[PDB]
Design a protein around this nucleic acid. Sequence first.
RNA 1: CAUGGUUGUCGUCAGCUCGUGUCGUGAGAUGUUGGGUUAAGUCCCGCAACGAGCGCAACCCUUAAGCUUAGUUGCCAUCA
Length: 224
Amino acid sequence: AVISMKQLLEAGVHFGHQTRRWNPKMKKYIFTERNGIYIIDLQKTVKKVDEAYNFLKQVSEDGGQVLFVGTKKQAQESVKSEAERAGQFYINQRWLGGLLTNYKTISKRIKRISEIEKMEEDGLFEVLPKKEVVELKKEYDRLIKFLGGIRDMKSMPQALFVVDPRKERNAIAEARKLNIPIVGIVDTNCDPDEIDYVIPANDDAIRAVKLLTAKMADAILEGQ
RNA sequence: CAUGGUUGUCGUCAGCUCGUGUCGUGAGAUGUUGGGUUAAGUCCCGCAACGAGCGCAACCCUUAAGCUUAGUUGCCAUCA
């Protein structure tokens, strides 16, 4: 559950953002400033972390899944790797506006993937007009790009893991509309009230994203 | 100038809309905007939009060249 402090300042977790870009609601979680950068208090960080850790093992033991998001490029592979580690579902590309609120139309497109995998094996990708061969292939690749990691999600996820709340604000709006708890990693200049389980950690360092989402992946691993 | 049916017209112009979702107290908006491109909301990239339908293509006829079948009532090369 707890992460050693040195594992954080080695991962750049203490790093925040410039004083220029600062949300004054982070003043509770900020510990002084270095080189004009608001250094996050690692103690507070760890504390908050080991509390979304117990909530997440609760979700995995109940049977719920966590929708990993983090379309940000620095979080892209970190989200993908640790979600499949836990058998959860991840988002790595453009968050489809209304994939949770408008699941009615998204459900057909999600099942379109498994449907598109079907015509290949039932033989109508073998008999096809020349342009339709690539046309239906193009429809596949678009869908794999977005609904690649959530193709097995059937209903609304019982939990959602946001890497950067400010970046993927479109996902948080859907979650709050359907009462979906969010575990989020806030660096600075982010709203700590738009999410419920707050991780005060750096959001740009490549290893910092990996280290915290792995512990959150460890949370599910100790629940299933 | 009660109408069915049929027709011109803008104009073969490329637009016209819908479902679910989202924003807006509301009329309304989005998608149908932006970066390019096309004869074409034609197509791509992105984007609170995700998908559709009537539209535009294509599909259908004729034409332009070729190959099989066919030899009359078509044709006339090898020959009289």
